[PDB]
Design a protein around this ligand. Structure first.
Ligand SMILES: [Cl-]
Length: 743
């Protein structure tokens, strides 16, 4: 039994290694230390300084350098006793300051132990290296074990959710968020892998597994922060029957990065699929698709990157092709999908020229005809739709000859439409196959980014940040009930903060940012400036969460849960409307392609509501998501990047701390720190501290009484503790002191 077998890879890779003795005595030390900032400037870098003396009011301690310093006892970041180094739950720390938190995490990570609980959260730090803790053999160990029985692990929360589901007959949720490359996708995949195993009977299960490889081909790409970035968020419903077996599944996708199709930063790549196709297509397909090397395509040849290190596009294509096969995509459907991809490539190879007059024209219809071919549309018709769309100028419908820029920008729009619609299609197709109308229970897995604060923040960042404000509030309300419940299950004694930021964004009356945005979107002639001015007119010095910049005329800031975020307004009106000329819609609507036809003919795909804005849709989709979550028992996994360099064994305190500040971990602890953070089961206390008092035996039948004894013996300030129905509750620092007592 691996749990017992100290020689198992379970013990090796998942636990702090244990020696022969448990004896309190081993960890004895007269030394007292604190966490300090060697440089007041950088306050996330800390060093440990041994307290050399103490006043009634302060502490005086020797630095790393050997230089003495002094601090107020009340600002003091006392270091927990060494015994606490490496505990599996930060809730178990006695001194809970930020530096204490970081160190526990660090201690763990230094042993390659990536998972740590912080109360209700499962903290997962990207190791940036392989750890063999996801084998079937590993899965098997977590079956039916309590959180407290096994080591922290993604499999563990997963197992806990499944048992709760079975036991409470309640739907569940796992919220996996964090920064790009923090490891959300990986963790998500492990959750499904595990549920598939633990609850499977397979064919279905297979299809379920296979959807992912498909989605990843189309929704993932190589970026500067990760080589296989998922550029879309998702909510995955794993469905089960009353008996506990997987009966189906559903996927909801969000915020796919369409911009990527037409433009990629230096070093990055376009979506994997493009590459897979160019490399994995039969030389007999190429020709049929007029394919060539990426260097041959504008949408591929601009980042200088066309291949991933230790990645075979050819091989991945096979992988993807197979998956499609398994889920249920006809050989034919598969063509057109490839065709669309192809055609997209072609579209971007159209060179707009404009000398004649001012309007663009096409001297070389090669690329054009190429695309029209694979699309099954009429080049003449498409040619005109791109450069000469009829626009309703009042009562009349007149064709405007577009210049080169506008012309290019239209083609671009056409490609993003095609891409986003195809994606929707894929997802809907997959769901047709996997989804259950008649389902008994479900476990939904939300895998999306946490708060986004980049150099430059745009409309999509406001969106994701809005979602985050809502999930953070959901967590907070969740923690508040659960805490009350606990105090209550024992017999202890005793509306929010995110609302305002939430209101500022999505408020209807007075209108918040998005409503103002929608208002401006109705006027064809509105501009970024009219937009931004309207926003400042409504909120500058008038809404405490908003800030109009001292000099920039194109940005505005929002005080988010994670801090202030500065947004820029460029193209917001265009983003909100997500326009596509109707002539283009016309052109594609008659496609000779059976798939392409759906992308333009099917309203559930070709349009939003078309009537509602992108903002309005975002809002609604989020309300739906939240309502769903609301009906579930949730579980939270915070994924953390250890540094910005994709390096293992490099845990940077500033990078780390900042994530924990933003993701709710540190706040949860601060809040916890205030009450009775340490909650021990009587026997457990006694079992370690019986030697602290006289006459107390390790194994006492009246554990509560015996606890009272030791406490008493040591004359502990009863304000510091609370006797509960099954556990002794301790205020911060109390247990540290106890631990620090003499045998
Ligand atoms: Cl593994």
């Amino acid at each position: 039994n691996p749990i017992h077998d100290r020689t198992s890879d379970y013990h090796k890779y998942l636990k702090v290694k244990q020696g022969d003795s448990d004896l309190f005595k081993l960890t004895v030390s007269d030394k007292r230390y604190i966490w300090y900032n060697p440089d007041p400037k950088e306050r996330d870098s800390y060093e440990c300084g041994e307290i050399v003396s103490e006043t009634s009011d302060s502490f005086t301690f020797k630095t790393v350098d050997g230089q003495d310093r002094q601090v107020k006892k009340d600002d003091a970041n006392q270091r927990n006793p060494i015994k606490f180094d490496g505990v599996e739950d930060m809730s178990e720390l006695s001194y809970l300051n930020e530096p204490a938190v970081f160190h526990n995490l660090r201690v763990r990570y230094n042993q390659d132990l990536i998972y740590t609980y912080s109360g209700l959260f499962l903290v997962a730090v990207n190791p940036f290296k392989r750890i063999p803790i996801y084998t079937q053999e590993m899965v098997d160990i977590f079956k039916g074990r309590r959180r407290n029985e096994v080591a922290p692990h993604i499999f563990a929360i997963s197992d806990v959710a499944y048992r709760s589901m079975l036991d409470d007959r309640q739907n569940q949720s796992l919220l996996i968020t964090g920064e790009s490359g923090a490891g959300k996708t990986e963790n998500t995949k492990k959750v499904i892998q595990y549920l598939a195993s633990v609850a499977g009977r397979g064919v279905l299960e297979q299809q379920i597994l296979q959807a992912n490889p498909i989605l990843e081909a189309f929704g993932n790409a190589k970026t500067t922060r990760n080589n296989n970035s998922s550029r879309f968020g998702k909510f995955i419903e794993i469905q089960f029957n009353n008996a506990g077996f997987i009966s189906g599944a559903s996927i909801q996708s969000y915020l796919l990065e369409k911009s990527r199709v037409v433009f990629q930063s230096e070093t990055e790549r376009n979506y994997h699929i493009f590459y897979q196709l160019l490399a994995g297509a039969t030389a007999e397909e190429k020709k049929a698709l007029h394919l060539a090397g990426p260097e041959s395509f504008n949408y591929l040849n601009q980042s200088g990157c066309v291949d991933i290190k230790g990645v075979s596009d050819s091989e991945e294509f096979k992988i993807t092709r197979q998956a499609m096969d398994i889920v249920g995509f006809s050989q034919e459907e598969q063509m057109s999908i490839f065709k669309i991809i192809a055609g997209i490539l072609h579209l971007g190879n159209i060179k707009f020229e404009k000398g004649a007059g001012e309007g663009a024209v096409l001297k070389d219809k090669t690329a054009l005809n190429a695309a029209s071919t694979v699309f099954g549309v009429n080049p003449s018709v498409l040619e005109k739709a791109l450069m000469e769309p009829r626009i309703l100028a009042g009562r009349d419908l007149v064709a405007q000859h577009l210049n080169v820029e506008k012309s290019s920008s239209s083609r671009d729009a056409l490609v993003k439409a095609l891409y986003g619609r195809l994606f929707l299609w894929l997802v809907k197709k997959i769901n047709n196959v996997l989804c259950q109308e008649r389902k008994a229970y479900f476990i939904g897995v939300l895998d999306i980014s946490g708060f986004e604060i980049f150099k430059v923040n745009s409309f999509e960042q406001l969106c994701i940040n809005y979602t985050n404000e809502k999930l953070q509030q959901f967590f907070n309300h969740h923690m508040f009930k659960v805490e009350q419940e606990e105090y209550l299950k024992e017999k202890i004694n005793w509306g929010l903060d995110s609302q305002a930021t939430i209101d500022l964004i999505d408020g209807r009356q007075p209108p918040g940012i998005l409503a103002l945005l929608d208002e401006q979107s109705v006027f064809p002639n509105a501009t970024d400036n009219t937009l931004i001015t309207k926003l400042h007119s409504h909120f500058s010095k008038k809404n405490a969460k908003y800030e109009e910049p001292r000099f920039s005329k194109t940005e505005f800031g929002v005080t988010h849960y994670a801090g202030q975020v500065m947004y820029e307004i460029q193209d917001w009106l265009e983003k909100n409307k997500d326009p596509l000329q109707q002539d283009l819609e016309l052109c594609f609507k008659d496609s000779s392609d059976n798939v392409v036809t759906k992308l333009f003919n099917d309203p559930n795909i070709a349009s939003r509501a078309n009537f509602i804005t992108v903002a309005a849709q975002y809002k609604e989709q989020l309300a739906s998501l939240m309502a769903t979550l609301e009906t579930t028992n949730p579980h939270f996994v915070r994924c953390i990047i250890p540094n910005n360099k994709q390096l293992p064994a490099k845990l940077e305190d500033k990078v780390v701390l900042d994530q924990l500040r933003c993701n709710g971990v540190l706040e949860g602890i601060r809040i916890t720190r205030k009450g009775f953070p340490n909650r021990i089961i009587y026997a457990d206390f006694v079992k370690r501290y019986y030697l602290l008092a006289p006459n107390v035996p390790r194994d006492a039948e009246d554990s509560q009484k015996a606890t009272d004894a030791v406490l008493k013996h040591l004359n502990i300030d009863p304000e510091q503790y609370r006797f509960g129905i099954t556990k002794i509750f301790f205020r911060a620092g109390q247990l540290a002191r106890i631990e620090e007592a003499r045998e």
